[PDB]
Ligand binder design. Structure first.
Ligand SMILES: [Cl-]
Length: 305
């Protein structure tokens, strides 16, 4: 079962007022929403996924040409080990990260590193860049709904996410002939995160009462969650919630898993200052000192580490 009912993207054009209410209410309750009937070209989503699969199928030494770049913030991250007690013996996953391609001379280049690209997969730059920009665009439309839900101007978020420090992650879990007991519990630090392909993927959100709720959408949906930047902007009216991915069942073991989440971030220089309509007698301002998105990013990374 899924704990969160999908809201059709068809409502974005047909009845935007209802779209914003239903999506917003879901974010406010759970920190998550499920969006069905997206208009993204599925063949081009599938092409990006195929390029990811092709990249991860390359020899290890070929992949490692793209490792050690900016601490893994761009390019490839190989299989590694969790040294902590209680960690599974094997937690094998490999990553590719794509950040924003900035124009020459852009003011953010001093702190946002250039992308690297795998020459061995000729279509990768094109196919994967399309997916980055497609998910960034859909994120903008979701943010319109969030803005309206919050009784803001519909285009409120537009300048706030322009040239945002967003990351498309390509993630692969190879099949291992062994049971775990997948993604340890965490929250996201960014604005919103958009996840394709979560059907029968084991995603769960921690509810307020400490129960884990399955988020198991039908195919052709996006699962979207609030991150800490947006939680902070809204004086915690919209919560950034803890989620995990459980191991597949015995039957689904043996299948490789790929995921391509898009972590949408505010512009680095955007000052996060508490929305005054989220500051009330019962919910006083938790953030009297404002902070830029990049300052907040750096702080959360320091605290995570
Ligand atoms: Cl600039």
């Amino acid at each position: 079962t899924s704990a969160i009912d999908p809201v059709s993207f068809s409502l974005y054009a047909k009845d935007f007022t209802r779209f914003a209410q239903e999506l917003g209410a879901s974010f406010e309750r759970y920190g998550f929403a499920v969006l069905s009937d997206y208009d993204l070209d599925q063949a081009r989503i599938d092409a990006a996924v195929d390029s990811a699969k092709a990249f991860f199928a390359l020899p290890v030494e070929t992949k490692k040409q793209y490792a050690g770049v900016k601490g893994g913030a761009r390019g490839y991250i190989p299989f590694g080990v969790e040294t902590a007690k209680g960690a599974d013996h094997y937690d094998l996953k490999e990553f590719w990260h794509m950040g924003r391609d900035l124009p020459p001379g852009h003011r953010f280049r001093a702190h946002m590193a250039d992308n690297v690209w795998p020459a061995e997969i000729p279509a990768f730059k094109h196919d994967v860049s399309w997916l980055y920009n497609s998910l960034d665009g859909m994120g903008g439309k979701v943010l319109e709904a969030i803005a309206t839900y919050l009784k803001l101007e519909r285009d409120f978020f537009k300048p706030t996410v322009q040239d945002g420090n967003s990351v498309l992650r390509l993630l692969h879990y190879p099949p291992i002939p062994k049971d775990a007991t997948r993604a340890g519990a965490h929250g996201d630090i960014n604005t919103i995160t958009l996840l394709l392909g979560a059907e029968e993927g084991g995603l769960e959100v921690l509810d307020r009462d400490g129960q884990w709720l399955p988020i198991n959408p039908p195919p052709g949906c996006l699962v979207i969650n609030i991150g800490d930047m947006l939680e902070r902007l809204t004086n915690n009216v919209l919560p950034s919630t803890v989620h995990r991915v459980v191991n597949p069942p015995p039957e689904r073991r043996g299948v490789p898993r790929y995921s391509t989440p898009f972590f949408l971030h505010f512009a680095s220089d955007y000052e996060i200052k508490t929305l005054q309509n989220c500051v009330t007698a019962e919910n006083p301002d938790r953030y009297p000192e404002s902070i830029t998105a990049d300052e907040f990013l750096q702080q959360r990374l320091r605290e995570i580490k």
